[PDB]
Each structure stands twice: as C-alpha cells, then as structure tokens.
C-alpha cells in the first residue's frame, strides 16, 4: 500500500492479547460478548498476515460457546459475520473452518447441535470455491452419517452426490475415491443404479493400479457387481469378480479367494452364451486354486 | 494456431519476481545471512533470469579477491551494480511482437 | 545509425543530441585558448591563426566591457552573435541598475540563449565555445561555455585544438598561480607557459600570443604585438 | 524499433511516442537528485560530480530557487533543467502579481506540467529531457512532486531520479519503513547525505561534492535556503561514519 | 594447437585493471575450482573483450 | 494446460468435446529461461 | 506506409492510422472506469492504481473537478489527462461569464469533441490519447453521461465503461439493463447507486478492492464532490453485508 | 559491440563484458618501454615526456611511435636512435599530416 | 490460362454473417451451457479468421478444465477470447468513420 504502521501494530497486538488470554477467558464468565468483541476489533484490519494471527485467539474463545448448549447459537451468528465482511483475503477463514470441525468432535454435542452448525457452515461456503472445497467435502460427510440412522438416508443420497460435482479441490486420490464409493452406496439405497454408473466413470480404473488404493479397488468392483446384478446382467457381474480375484490381497490370502472363485463360476454359467463366455470358462480350469474346491 | 493453440509469453521478471529468482540461488551458495538483498534487487532494473544467476557468480569474484569464504552485503551489492552497469551499455533488450 | 542526426529536434535512442556533440567537435578544430585566474586578476591567453603570411592573424579576444571579456574557439560567425549579445546585457546593467554585470548571472543568460536554438526547429546550437573572465564585486571569476549551454566555474580550463596538453600543464601547476596575488606579471607568465605546451608542430611568435587581463585596479586591456613582447 | 521517432508527435502502433521514451533515457545518464519530504518540510540533496579537480567547489549548483519558497533540482541535461526553471520563475512571479500571495505547490504542479506537455504536442520542438523534483511548504503543509520529461507528475513521500535511482528509491523505501511517521527535517538532513553516498556507486569513475538544501516551515520560516556550515558538516560525518 | 608459445602479461604494457578482470573470468574458475566447489556457484561460459581496435 | 493435462489423460478432454490441443510457443526477450523451462519439464515428467 | 507518420494524410482505405493509434493509447495506465446513471445521481467509479510505495496515494487521481456541477474521469495517460482537464475547466469558466449560466454536460462535451477534431484537422498538433467521460446531473436533462473520444466522436449513454478489461464490464451491464427494462437504477439515494457500481466491477474483474484501490466521484443534484478513501470504505462493507 | 546481437551478448553465454579503453597517459608510457626492450635504448630519452605529448594515441599507434623512430634513425644513416627521432615518430601518425581544415579560424 | 482460370480469393476481413455461422457449427460438436453467448464475439472484433475460431473454442475448454467443469460458462468463453483476440487495426470498435 504506502503505509507500514498498520502491519507492525497489529502483529504487536496479536502477541500482546495472547498473553492476556487468561484474563479474557475469566471475564468471559462475567460477559462473553464483552470478551469476544476485543478479538473482533483486530480482524477489522486490512493486513492479511496479521488477521491469520488474531483468528487463532478467536478459535480459543469460541470453544466455551460450543461447549455450552445454548451459546453455540452465537457461534452460528459469528461465523456468518466474519466470512461476509471481506473473508480477510481468503486466507484467514479457511484456517477457522478447519479447526471448527475438530472442536465439534471433541465437545460431543447432541446430534441436533452438530447438524445445525454444519448446515450454516455450508450455507456460507455455497458460491465460494477458492480453496473452500478441500474443507467443504469433509464438512458435508458429518451430515451423511447422522442421516443414515434417520429415515433421511435417501435425502443424504441427494446432498452428497451433487456436492462432489462442484467439489474436488486438491484433496488426495484416496479421499476422492472414498466419497465417490460412499455415494454409489447411497445411490443403491436411493434405487438409481444407473446414476451410480455415471459416478463410477468419473474415477479412472487406471488410478487403481498402485497399492496405496488397494483396498479401495476391492470395494469398488464389488459395488459394480451389485449394480449390474440389479439390472440382471450376469456377464458384467462375472467379469467384475474376476478383477477382484487378480488383486493381490484376494489371491495370496487363502481364505479371501474362496467365496470369490465360487461366485465367478456361478455367474459365468448364468451369462448369455457369448464368444466372451467361451474364452473365460476355460481359463477357470487352467488354475490349480479351483481343485481345492469340489 | 491449430498447431500451436496457446502462445505463451515469457516476459521480463517483474520487480517482485526478480527477488523470487534471486532467493533460490542464494539457497545454493554460501552467504553471511542477507535479507536486505530483496529491496536492492527489486529497485535495480535491466536484468533477466540469466543475469540474476550471474549476480551470484560476479559476487564470488569479489569473494575471491578480498579473501572471503562468504558473500557479504559488500560483495553482493557491488556485484549487482556491476552486472547492471554492463547491461545498460549493450543488450538493449529485443523487441517483442 | 546515424539517422538521428539530421535534426536537432530529435533525441537519439541513447538520449544524446548528436547535433550538440558535433558542435563540440567544431571547437576542437579551431584555435586553442586558455583560461586561468587568481583572486586579483583573470587572464586569457590565446593562440591566434593566420591563413597565409600576407594575412595578419585574426583577433580571438573581443572586449565585452571594461570589467568583462571573452575568447572564442570554433566558428567565428557564431562568436560574433554571442559577444554582441553579451554586451547588450552589460550595457543594460549600466543603464537600468548602474551596476557591473555579475559573471555568474551573465553565464546563465548565455545558457538561456543557447537553449533557445536547441528547442527550436531551425537554427543550430552555436558552433563556438567561449572562455569568459571578469572581475566584479565578488572578485575574479572564470567560466567555461559550451554549445549545450553549460557554464561551469573553474580556476583554470582550456578548450580547443589539442587542449589536453594545456590542461595537463594546468593540473600540475593549479595551486602555484592561485596563491600568487598582487603581481600581475606572474599570472601573465603562467598562462604563457601553458599554451606553449598545447602546441605541436609550431613555435611561439610575437603575434601568436594575445593577452587579455582584468583586475582589482586593471581596466580591460587587449595586448597584441609589441605589448606581449615584455612577456614573450 | 525503427520508425515513429524522427518526429515527436507521431504515434506508434503500440500507442506511444518513442522519442518521448528516449527522453527518459537522457535523464538516466544525469546525476542523482532525490527529495525526501518531511513532516514540516522537504530536503533536496544532489550529487554534483567533479569534472576535474580544477573545479571551484561550492559555487556551482544544480539547485535553483523559484520565487522565495519553492525548491527545484533537476536531473538530466544541466542546461535544459536551467531553461525550464527560468520559465517557472516567470510563471510563479505572474501568479504572485496577480493574486498577492505566494504559489501553492499543487498550483506550480499544474503549470509546469502544461509547459512540458506543450513541447510534446507540437512538431517543431524537441520535448524536454529532464526530471525536476520540486516542492516546498504552504498553508496546506509540505508537498513533494517529481515531474518526468514525459510531463507526468504525482506526489511522492520521497522521489529519486538519475543514474542512482536504483540505489536511491531502495534507500527511500527503507526510510518509509523505519519512519512512517514523517521523520523531522533535521534528521532528514543527515539522512539525505547517506542516500547520495550510496547512490554515488553508480558514478564511481568520478568524485563528487555533496550539496544539501532544504525548506522547512519551522526551522527556515517557510523559506528555502541552502544547508551549509555546521549542519552541512554533520551530515558529511554521518554519511562517512556509516559507509565505512 | 600448434603449441602456441607464451609471451606473458608483463609484455602487454599498461592496462593492468583490464588484465585482472579478464584473469578472473578465464584463469581462476579453472585453478580455484576448489572455490567453485566450496561456494557452489556456476561457471561463466565466456568473457567478451570489446573496445576500440 | 496444453501439454501436460492431455498427455496424462486425454480422456477428460473428449468429455469436454474439443480437439486435444498440442503446440506451445515460448517467445520473450532472451535470457528468461525458455530453454530452462524445456529442461525442467524434461526432468519431471520423464517421457521420450 | 506513409500514413501514420502524418496526421492528415489518409490511407487508401480512408482511415487515419495515426488517429486510431490514439484510441489504443488509453491503455498506458491500464485502469478501468465505469459510470452509470441512478435516478438522482451520476456515479463514476474508476480504479486508482497506486503502483509504487514511494508515491503518496492522495494525489493520485483521474477524477478532476472541472466546475461546480461538472466532473471528468480520465482513462489513458497522465500528461494528456491534465491538458484535457485544463481546457474543459477553461471553457467552463468562459461559458458562465459569456452566456451567464452554468455549463451542462452536453455543451462541454460537444465543445471538447469539436476541439479534438480541430487538433486532427491540422497537422500542426497531434490528437491526445486520452478518453474523456464527463459526468453530471444536468439542469433539465438530469443524469447525463457523454463520452468524448480522441477523434472527436461523442455519443451519450445509460452506462459506459472504458479501459483494458472494458469488454468484461460491458456484458454484466447489458444483462442488467435488459432484465430491468429501464435506462436507470431505481435506487433513490446516491449511497446505494455507488454500491451498485462497486458491485458489478468486483464481479467483472474478479478482484476485491480496498480503500487505496478505488476512486469514486459523485455527481449529485446541483453539487459535486469526490469521495475520500474512508467514505469509499463505508461503501465497500455495505456491499459485503446484506 | 554496437552491431552484436542482444541474444548474443547477455549472460549464460558471454557473462563477462570487459571493456578496453584507449590507453591512459601512464599506460601509453608503459607500452613504449615494452617494445624498446628489444632494441637500442639511450638514456637521453625520457618516456614520461613522450607520453604526455601523445594525446589521443591508441596502443597500435604507440607501436607506430616506436617503429617509426627506427625509420627516422635509418634515414639519418645513424646506427643509433636519438630522442629526437622519436618526436618525429609522433609526426608520422596522428590521423592528420599536421593540419586543421577550417574557413573560420 | 489452360492451367488456372479460377483465382478464388480467400479473405481475412469477412463479414458478420459468416463469423456467426462458423461459431454455431463449432458449438454443435462440443458442450455448451445456457450462459455462453457466441453472437457477441463477432461484433467486438471483426477481422477474425477461421483458424482462430478453432483457437477460441479449444481455449474455452482450457478455462473450463482449470475450474474442472464439464460445460463452458460465460466466464470461460470471455477469458479464452481475450487470448488471441488479435491486435488488428482493420477492426471496427475504435472507429469514427460512421
Ligand atoms: N526462471 C529462472 N529461474 C532460475 N534460473 C533461471 C531462470 N531463467 C533463467 N535462468 C538462468 O539463466 C540461464 C539461461 O537461460 P536460457 O539460456 O535457458 O534462456 P532463453 O530465454 O531460451 O534464451 P536464448 O535461447 O536466446 O539463449 C539458465 O540456465 C538459468 O541459470
Ligand atoms: Mg534457448
């Protein structure tokens, strides 16, 4: 800009009111809104570096509110007010969203309290997509699991499937895969297997070839078995269980290959007589695995 | 285009972006612990990436003469002015369409 | 290239005017003149040229006024304009303020005169450099004039043909002539020495030397001929 | 490139006037001129190179005064900067007759920018090739501008031009960092000297002479004057001490 | 090569500063290659000699 | 955008519906490391 | 091949190449301006790009007070910006004492535009590279925006934009007026019309603005003032808050 | 150097850009004595005198002071070079033949 | 003659009819979105040629994959048009000969 007095002063201020952290917390028992406004005045600054530092203090203060079962309402309000103002670049609030999620887990609040807090978090972040994404998809997963126990499981299929078409971010390949398999599972329950198919074609099958995703490969194929089974295509179901068989976990462990080999065989016979069925049935005979089963 | 769909311009490094080139090569070399370099590099002009990796190299000919095992702010800033000076006698910088 | 001469109104890519530098050249090709001073006198000594030995030399000191005077080096038509301009100002000072013109204010008026030709399309920056001396109320001064129009005060300088030899003399003997004050002969003698050295393939003649002097109790006086023959 | 110089009003296809850019390049070859604006004043310092050791010392200035309160220092060609200040004295003088007060610094900024602009607008004159830093003190406090040969000006907290603009803009950039407050004019006298001393490592072939001037509301009665004597020596000692 | 003989820098009269600069450029990254390995700079790929003929 | 994304997987550019593009021009005033850029992408991807 | 080394000499298409290279000099400071009409105000909001920290920001401007009821926003270069501003001021003065009343937005813009034509008519001056947009609320026309171009072409407007990223500004504006079906903004105080101009500019460019990075001039009924950075700041959190 | 390409001359390729000026007054002096260590040398000669009087002499011209002195010495029919022969060695090259061409001085 | 009789010119100035047609036919072979307006890129610049219409769309899906999106928005379309918009002075948007 042209003035360097605001950069210095706020870096000073954040350090100073973190040694006064005990004095403020005690005054919070006396007037929680008196204490909180001290910290707000800091985040009216126009220097983003110093805004990251004062939000650390906000995070400390807001635990007490969450922990009380009627002060968490003022948490909802506060989130809303901090985000809309400027977002203090796009840096400050991102750190806040990440640390709010871990505090929700440790408080152990009522299921109602846990949902309403997450629902207001996603409202804020709707149209933003800058680096919110990385956090947002983790945020929404807390609704889905609460909603499984509810009769609202179908509604959970709707929210989570739409979300990942807008959200990707920079998350790891293992996380991305895990959401999309969860969604396929919620679309079996919704009764749209065809919808599930479209989500399966998003992740490449080439992405499975490494062993960090080795478990994910197993669940994925097994979901594709359920999906073509439902439409009653036994040629497709026959081919999928063969993918599972060649995977290293199944093949080497003595126990795990057994139910798999039995299922390939039952389904291959149920397949329409193709040129495909021919080549594959006589592959089954070549194997010495088969001879243990009788 | 249609062979050549993007036409990417690499331009001169900007005033913030010359010091970002500078910072990596001073990882590489030995130094007395400098940080007032960032401003000197920034308002000094007539440079390009190549000449920035020469400003470390020209700073180690002063290290050689004085007999120093590090690049001081005496060695360094004397070097930035020397590279700068020669660029502004010749090497006008070519025209770019 | 050199297509950025041909106009005195176009800056070159390098930010020079070639035309003003080419004016600096014209000086070297004409005669040499030396300035030097003390604090009681300023003295000019100038090499005069002839064209043939029926020709009787050419005057290169013009009396400006009785407490001012100048020498020329370079083109002679360019010289005439400036020595005339300079005199207008000295007469003006006498008529309007009854006051001797100050060398420093003179020089900045001369500067102006030059920058008038430099901005304008048409015309040339003047092809002559002048070494200006005077003695005013603040004692002796010596300025060096250029085509660019820069006036610079100096204890001693030289411009013109092979002037490095005189500037070399001057450097070595800078302090010796500064400290001498009250003896007009010694500054006269010292300038003689400098201009001898400037020469290459020539010797001093009684009609080469021209001596010009101004002081505390010395009117402007132009010596030539048998008046520079006490101090040959 | 080639073409659209050789004229000083001809637009380029890029959208520029070439010859006007070549002006700035001449200003770069000129000696270093800086101004540091201060909280109750302005300080102008300039690096005056020594042609030879036969020069009279402290008798040749690139500092000139305008009216009785406005400082000007130019970098670029020495006589061009002179010519532009003379025009300025007449303009400040016409303002002064007309209204019976000294000029505002914003007033002068407008007027000067029209005279530089006039020579970029016509085909029979070469545009100027000097920057001129100027400013002073008025009713409305202290102010500092730097006028480019393009005829561009803005206020500055601190301004530098010439061969040493590379060093000088950087030192001034530290100066704002260390003092956003303003810095007194006295302490800026001692500062002015250090800035030049480090800017003289871009003109190291020759020797220099340091001349400082100032204009301060409370330590010069609003008037511009040369800094000399004890103030000038202290600044020398300051610059000498820290350079070694 | 034709085995060019040496004629040493001392028989190149005057111009002491230029010879020292040119020696920095060519001679000493070879010799004090101990110093390019310590310092960890890159080698210069040439030195231009320009001037009036 | 042009080089490394259709190189890794051209399958997502078919969904988009444009032809996979090829060709990059690097142009700039010299010493800016246009060659260095070629040696940096030669290092990292590790193709032919 | 002849025909931008001269002001007056035409090309064989009947174009003046040199005059058009002035329409292309308005990118040299690289700022954008937007001025829109409300229903009791005319707003102009243009960037203030203060590049360096050696500059004091409060002397950086493009909005010039021309007269009691007249502002002007400049896009393009500073040297010509100042020449445009003095002539319009000089003429504002002339009109009032000669013809004894205030100067409307038309009268000034037409006179400058004719003046630009004269400067292109001779080969003894050049065109300037600056685009001028005059802003006022007129005495019997109300809100008025007249854009005066470097050739001397002028057309009035509901909304106009100028600068490098002008095209991005232009689609956003078009869609607004199309959908609304009025040639105005129906917000009935200038404090929200200003907010509306900020709003569209953030979306177009994709950039946040801050106190130093905007300049706002406001023509109100029968008076004119250019807003400080702290008043602009009030406006900027009004946007953020709904 | 003014016709060399700007992609030629720039770091990465040519890193050092070393200028050779016309030789200074002392430097000129030094060159004289270095050619004179291969031929007759008299103690009449003073090489610091000759250096000053050569003004705008490059080093090859200074080989043409010392060569041309031996040309003067042979034309005499001397089997010795004198200090004078060197002064007349200076008059051989100067880029002039002892002139200026003027219609004003 | 005997060899060439037809000297069929191929222009680069073109007209508003044929810019419009080349755009809709390229935008019938790839995705679109409802916000993506193609008939507002033939008026802003006016000396565009057929190869550059094949640049503009390709580059439209390069903004679209930067976001990671399956359709081409008006934000994508505009950014990619500003790359390789061409600098030509044979354009009409900067004119006054009307
Ligand atoms: N962006 C950069 N980061 C760090 N080093 C760089 C950078 N740019 C250039 N360099 C340095 O400069 C060197 C020379 O650059 P390079 O020759 O590759 O350039 P170029 O722009 O293709 O020019 P030309 O092909 O005309 O020589 C590199 O080997 C590296 O040391
Ligand atoms: Mg290369």
Contact E39, B60 (CB under 8 A): yes
| Mutation site, H4, H5, H11, H12, interface F, largest F CB count within 10 A | H12
Would you say D120 and G125 are in contact if contact means Cβ atoms under 8 Å apart? no
- Concatenated DSSP letters for chain G? --SSSSSSPPPTTS--HHHHTTTTSS-SS---EEEEE-SSEEEEEEE-----SSB-GGG--S-EE-SSS-EEEEES-HHHHHHHHHHHHHHHHHHHHHHSS---HHHHHHHHHHHHHHHHH-SSS-----EEEEEEEETTTEEEEEEE-SSS-EEE-SEEEESTTHHHHHHHHHHHHHHH-SSS---SSHHHHHHHHHHHHHHHH-----STTEEEEEEETTEEEE--HHHHHHHHHHHH--
Q: Starting from the CA of residue B17, give the closest ligand.
A: 1
Tell me how many helices (H) and strands (E) chain H has.
Answer: 4, 1
Range of the structural domain that residue D90 is part of: 1-244
Residue C196 · residue C204 · CB < 8 Å: yes
Q: What are phi and psi of C173, to 5 degrees?
A: -105, 20
Contacts of B64 in chain E (CB under 8 A): 24, 28, 32, 35
Q: Which of A2, A85, A86 sits opposite G57 (nearest CB)?
A: A2
Are the C-beta atoms of residues C34 and C185 closer than 8 Å to each other?
A: no
Return the closest-CA partner of residue A98 out of A144, A138, A140: A138
Distance CA H62, CA B29 (A): 45
Q: Strands, E, within C117-184: which ranges?
A: 128-136, 139-145, 151-153, 156-159
In total, the C-beta contacts within 8 angstroms joining chain F to chain I are 28
CA of G138 relative to ligand 2 center, distance in Å: 61
Q: What is the distance of C-alpha I45 from the center of its chain? A: 9
Q: How far apart are CA H34 and CA H90, in angstroms?
A: 17
DSSP strands (E only) in chain C: 33-37, 41-47, 61-65, 68-74, 128-136, 139-145, 151-153, 156-159, 209-215, 221-223
CA distance A31 to I37: 56
Rg (CA), chain D: 18
d(CA I70, CA A170): 18
Sheet of strand C61-65, all strands in order from the earlier edge strand to the far edge: C61-65, C68-74, C128-136, C139-145, C151-153
Closest CB to D151: pick one of G79, G86, G126. Answer: G79
Biggest CA–CA distance in chain I, Å, is 57
The C-alpha of B86 sits at a distance from chain H's nearest C-alpha, in angstroms, of 7
Q: Ligand 2 mean position to B1 CA, how many Å?
A: 22
Helix (H) / strand (E) containing D41? strand D41-49
For residues C109 and G49, give the distance between their C-alpha atoms in angstroms, rounded to a whole number. Answer: 43
d(CA H46, CA H42): 9
Best of F27, F28, F35, F36 to mutate for ligand 1, by most ligand atoms within 8 A of CB?
A: F36
Q: How many CB pairs under 8 A join A and G?
A: 23
The alpha carbon of residue D23 is apart from the nearest alpha carbon of chain C, in Å, by 6
What CA–CA distance (Å, rounded) separates C41 from C189? 13
Count of Cβ atoms closer than 10 Å to residue A78 Cβ? 16
Concatenated DSSP letters for D44-95?
EEEEEE-SSTTBPSSS--SEEEETTTEEEEEEE-HHHHHHHHHHHHHHHHHH
Q: Which of F35, F39, F43 to mutate to test the pocket of ligand 1 (most atoms within 8 A of CB)?
A: F35
On chain I, the residues whose CB falls within 8 A of the CB of F12 are 65
Hey, how many other C-beta atoms are within 10 angstroms of the C-beta on A77? 10
- Using alpha carbons, select from G136, G132, G139 the residue that is nearest to residue G154: G132
User: Sheet containing G159-162: which strands, arranged edge to edge?
Assistant: G159-162, G33-37, G41-47, G214-220, G223-226
CA gap D178, C227 in Å, rounded: 68
Which residue, E40, E43, E15, is CA-closest to E28? E43
Experimental method: cryo-EM
Decide: C136 and C103 in contact? Cβ < 8 Å.
yes
Structure tokens, C228: 């520079």
Dihedral over alpha carbons D173, D178, D181, D186 (to 10 degrees)? -90
Residues in I touching B7 (Cβ below 8 Å) = 83-84
Q: Give yes or no for a contact between B19 and F37, defined as CB atoms under 8 angstroms apart.
A: no
Tokens 């001396």, located at residue: C133
Beta bridge partners of E45: none
F29 C-alpha vs ligand 1 centroid, how far in Å?
11
- What distance in Å separates residue G141's CA from the closest CA in chain D? 33
Residues facing residue G35 across a β-bridge: G44, G160
**Positions of D marked catalytic:** 31
- Contact check, Cβ <8 Å, H11/B94: no
Q: What's the gap in Å between the CA of C12 and the closest CA on chain D?
A: 7
Tell whether G179 lies on the interface with A, counting CB pairs under 8 A.
Answer: no
H14 φ/ψ angles, rounded to the nearest 5 degrees? -115, 120
CB A277 within 8 A of CB A237: no
Q: Which residues of E are annotated as a binding site for ATP?
A: 51-53
Per-position b or e across D93-108, b if 16+ CB within 10 A of its CB: eebeeeeeebbbbebb
Distance of CA H9 to the CA centre of its chain: 30
Quick one: tokens of B21?
């080139």
Distance from C-alpha of G130 to C-alpha of G86, rounded to nearest angstrom: 13
This structure's resolution (Å) is 4.9
- E47-50/H16-19 β-pairing: parallel
- What's the F32 CA to ligand 1 centre distance in angstroms? 5
Give ∠ CA H40-H46-H51 in degrees, rounded to 5: 110
User: What is the dihedral sign for C-alpha G113, G115, G119, G122?
Assistant: positive
G147 and G51 in contact (C-beta within 8 Å)? no
Give the C-alpha separation, G87 to G95, whole Å: 12
Number of domains in chain D: 1
Q: Which of B10, B50, B51 sits opposite F26 (nearest CB)?
A: B10
Please tell me the distance from the alpha carbon of residue C130 to that of residue C147, in angstroms, as a whole number.
Answer: 9
Distance H1 CA to ligand 2 centre (A): 22
CB atoms under 10 Å from CB of A174, counted, come to: 11
**Choice from B18, B20, B29, B49 to test ligand 1 binding pocket (greatest atom count within 8 A of CB):** B49
Q: What is the DSSP letter of H7?
A: T
CB atoms G241 and A86 under 8 Å: no
Structural tokens at position A97: 């969203």
Residues D189 and D187: their CA atoms lie apart, in Å, by 5
**CATH number for position D191:** 3.60.20.10
A170 near A134, Cβ under 8 Å? yes
Integer Cα distance of A273 and A259 in angstroms? 24
- Residue H17's H or E segment, with its range, is strand H16-19
Q: Take residue C126 and report the two structure tokens written for it.
A: 């003047």
**CA atoms of D53 and D197, how far apart (whole Å):** 19
């Amino acid at each position: 800009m042209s003035r360097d007095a605001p950069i210095k002063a706020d870096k000073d201020y954040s350090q100073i009111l973190k040694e006064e952290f005990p004095k403020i917390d005690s005054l919070a028992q006396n007037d929680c809104n008196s204490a909180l406004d001290q910290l707000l005045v800091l985040e009216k600054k126009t220097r983003q570096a110093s805004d990251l530092a004062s939000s650390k203090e906000v995070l400390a203060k807001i635990v007490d509110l969450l922990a009380s079962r009627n002060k968490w309402d003022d948490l909802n309000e506060q989130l809303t007010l901090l985000s809309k103002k400027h977002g203090q670049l796009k840096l400050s609030i991102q750190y806040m969203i990440q640390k709010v999620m871990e505090y929700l887990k440790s408080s152990k609040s009522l299921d109602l309290n846990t949902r309403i807090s997450v629902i207001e978090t996603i409202r804020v972040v709707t149209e933003n997509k800058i680096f919110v994404e990385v956090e947002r998809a983790r945020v929404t997963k807390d609704l889905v699991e609460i909603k499984k126990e509810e009769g609202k499981i179908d509604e959970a299929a709707d929210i989570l499937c739409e979300l990942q078409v807008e959200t990707y971010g920079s998350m790891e390949m293992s996380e991305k895969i895990q959401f999309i398999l969860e969604q396929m599972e919620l679309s079996i329950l919704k009764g749209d297997y065809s919808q599930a198919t479209v989500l399966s074609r998003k992740i490449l099958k080439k992405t499975f070839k490494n062993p960090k995703y080795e478990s994910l490969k197993l669940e994925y194929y097994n979901l594709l078995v359920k999906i073509s089974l439902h439409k009653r295509e036994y040629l497709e179901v026959a081919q999928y269980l063969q993918e599972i068989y060649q995977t290293d976990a199944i093949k080497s462990d003595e126990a795990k290959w057994k139910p798999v080999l039995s299922h390939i065989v039952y389904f291959l016979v149920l397949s329409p007589y193709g040129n495909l069925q021919n080549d594959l049935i006589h592959k089954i005979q070549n194997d010495n695995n088969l001879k243990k089963l009788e | 285009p249609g062979r050549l769909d993007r036409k990417v311009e690499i331009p001169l490094p900007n005033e913030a972006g010359r010091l970002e080139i500078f910072k990596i090569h001073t990882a590489k070399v030995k130094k007395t612990g400098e940080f007032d370099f960032e401003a000197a590099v920034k308002m000094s002009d007539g440079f390009n990436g190549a000449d920035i990796r020469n400003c470390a190299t020209e700073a180690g000919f002063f290290a050689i003469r004085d007999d120093r095992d590090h690049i001081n702010p005496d060695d360094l800033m004397k070097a930035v002015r020397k590279v700068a000076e020669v660029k502004k006698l010749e090497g006008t910088i070519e025209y770019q369409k | 290239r050199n297509n950025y001469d041909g106009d005195t109104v176009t800056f070159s890519p390098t930010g020079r005017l070639f035309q003003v530098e080419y004016a600096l050249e014209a000086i070297k090709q004409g005669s040499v003149t030396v300035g030097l001073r003390s604090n009681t006198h300023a003295v000019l000594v100038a090499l005069k040229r002839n064209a043939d030995e029926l020709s009787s030399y050419q005057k290169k000191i013009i009396k400006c006024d009785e407490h001012m005077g100048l020498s020329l080096a370079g083109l002679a038509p360019d010289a005439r304009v400036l020595s005339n301009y300079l005199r207008q100002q000295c007469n003006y000072s006498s008529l309007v303020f009854n006051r001797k013109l100050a060398v420093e204010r003179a020089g900045h008026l001369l500067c102006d005169k030059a920058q008038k030709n430099t901005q304008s399309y048409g015309g040339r920056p003047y092809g002559v450099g002048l070494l200006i001396i005077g003695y005013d109320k603040s004692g002796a001064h010596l300025l060096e004039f250029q085509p660019s129009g820069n006036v610079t005060e100096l204890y001693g300088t030289a411009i013109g043909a092979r002037s490095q030899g005189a500037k070399t003399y001057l450097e070595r003997t800078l302090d010796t002539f500064i400290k001498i004050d009250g003896n007009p002969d010694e500054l006269i003698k010292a300038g003689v020495e400098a201009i001898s050295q400037s020469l290459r393939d020539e010797s001093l003649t009684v009609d080469n030397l021209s001596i010009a002097i101004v002081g505390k109790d010395t009117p402007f006086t132009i010596y030539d001929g048998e008046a520079v023959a006490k101090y040959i | 490139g080639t073409g659209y110089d050789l004229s000083n009003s001809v637009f380029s296809p890029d959208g520029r006037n070439f010859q006007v850019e070549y002006a700035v390049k001449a200003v770069e070859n000129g000696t270093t001129s800086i101004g540091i604006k201060c909280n109750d004043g302005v300080v102008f310092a300039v690096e005056k190179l020594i042609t030879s050791k036969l020069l009279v010392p402290q008798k040749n200035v690139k500092i000139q005064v305008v009216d009785r309160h406005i400082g000007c220092v130019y970098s670029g060609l020495i006589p061009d900067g002179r010519h532009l200040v003379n025009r300025g004295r007449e303009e400040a003088a016409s303002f002064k007759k007309l209204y019976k007060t000294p000029i505002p610094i914003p007033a002068f900024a407008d007027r000067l920018g029209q005279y530089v602009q006039a020579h970029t607008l016509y085909n029979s004159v070469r545009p100027f090739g000097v920057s001129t830093i100027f400013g002073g003190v008025d009713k409305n406090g202290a102010h500092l501008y730097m006028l480019e040969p393009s005829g561009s000006y803005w206020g500055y907290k601190g301004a530098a031009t010439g061969k040493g603009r590379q060093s000088a803009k950087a030192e001034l950039e530290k100066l704002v960092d260390h003092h956003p407050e303003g810095l007194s004019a006295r302490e800026a006298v001692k500062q002015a000297a250090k800035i030049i001393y480090l800017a003289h490592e871009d003109n190291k072939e020759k020797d220099f002479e340091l001349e400082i001037s100032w204009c301060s509301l409370s330590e010069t009665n609003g008037l511009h004057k040369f800094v000399k004597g004890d103030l000038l020596q202290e600044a020398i000692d300051f610059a000498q001490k820290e350079i070694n | 090569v034709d085995e060019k003989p040496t004629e040493t820098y001392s028989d190149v009269g005057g111009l002491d500063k230029q010879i020292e600069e040119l020696v920095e450029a060519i001679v000493l990254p070879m010799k004090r290659a101990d110093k390019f390995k310590d310092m960890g700079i890159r080698a210069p790929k040439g030195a231009l000699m320009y001037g009036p003929p | 955008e042009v080089i490394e994304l259709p190189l890794k997987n051209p399958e997502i550019f078919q969904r988009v519906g444009i032809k996979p593009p090829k060709g990059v021009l690097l142009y700039g005033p010299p010493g800016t490391g246009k060659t260095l850029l070629a040696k940096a992408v030669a290092a990292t991807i590790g193709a032919n | 091949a002849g025909y931008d080394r001269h002001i007056t000499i035409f090309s064989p298409e009947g174009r003046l190449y040199q005059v058009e290279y002035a329409f292309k000099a308005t990118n040299q400071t690289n700022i954008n301006s937007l001025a829109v009409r409300g229903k009791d105000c005319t707003v102009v909001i243009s960037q203030k790009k203060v590049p360096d920290k050696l500059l004091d920001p409060t002397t950086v401007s493009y909005i010039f007070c021309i007269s009691r009821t007249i502002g002007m926003v400049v896009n393009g270069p500073i040297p010509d910006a100042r020449n445009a501003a003095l002539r319009a001021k000089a003429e504002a003065a002339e009109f009032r004492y000669k013809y004894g009343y205030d100067m409307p937005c038309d009268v000034l813009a037409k006179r400058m535009a004719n003046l630009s034509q004269i400067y292109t008519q001779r080969a003894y001056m050049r065109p300037l590279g600056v685009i001028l947009t005059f802003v006022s609320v007129d005495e019997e026309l109300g809100p008025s925006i007249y854009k005066t171009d470097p050739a001397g072409y002028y057309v009035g407007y509901k909304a106009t934009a100028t600068g490098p990223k002008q095209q991005e500004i232009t689609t956003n504006l078009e869609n607004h007026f199309k959908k609304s079906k009025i040639d105005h903004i129906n917000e009935e105080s200038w404090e929200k019309v200003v907010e509306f101009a900020i709003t569209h500019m953030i979306d177009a460019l994709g950039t946040e603005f801050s106190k130093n990075d905007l300049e706002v001039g406001v023509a109100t009924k029968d008076k004119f003032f250019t807003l400080s950075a702290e008043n602009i700041e009030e406006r900027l959190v009004a946007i953020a808050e709904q | 150097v003014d016709v060399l390409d700007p992609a030629l001359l720039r770091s990465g390729r040519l890193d050092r850009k070393i200028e050779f000026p016309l030789p200074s007054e002392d430097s000129r002096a030094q060159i004289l004595q270095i050619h004179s260590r291969k031929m007759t040398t008299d103690d009449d000669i003073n090489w610091q005198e000759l250096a000053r009087s050569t003004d705008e002499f490059n080093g090859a011209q200074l080989k043409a002071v010392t060569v041309e002195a031996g040309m003067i010495a042979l034309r005499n029919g001397q089997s010795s070079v004198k200090h004078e022969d060197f002064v007349e060695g200076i008059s051989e090259v100067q880029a002039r033949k002892s002139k200026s061409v003027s219609f004003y001085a | 003659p005997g060899r060439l009789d037809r000297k069929i010119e191929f222009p680069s100035l073109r007209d508003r009819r044929e810019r419009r047609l080349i755009f809709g036919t390229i935008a019938s072979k790839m995705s679109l979105a409802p916000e993506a307006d193609l008939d507002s890129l033939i008026i802003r610049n006016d000396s565009l040629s057929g190869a550059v219409i094949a640049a503009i769309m390709q580059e439209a899906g390069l903004r679209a994959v930067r976001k990671n999106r399956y359709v081409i928005l008006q934000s994508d379309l505009e950014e990619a048009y500003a790359t390789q918009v061409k600098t030509d002075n044979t354009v009409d948007k900067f004119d006054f000969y009307k």
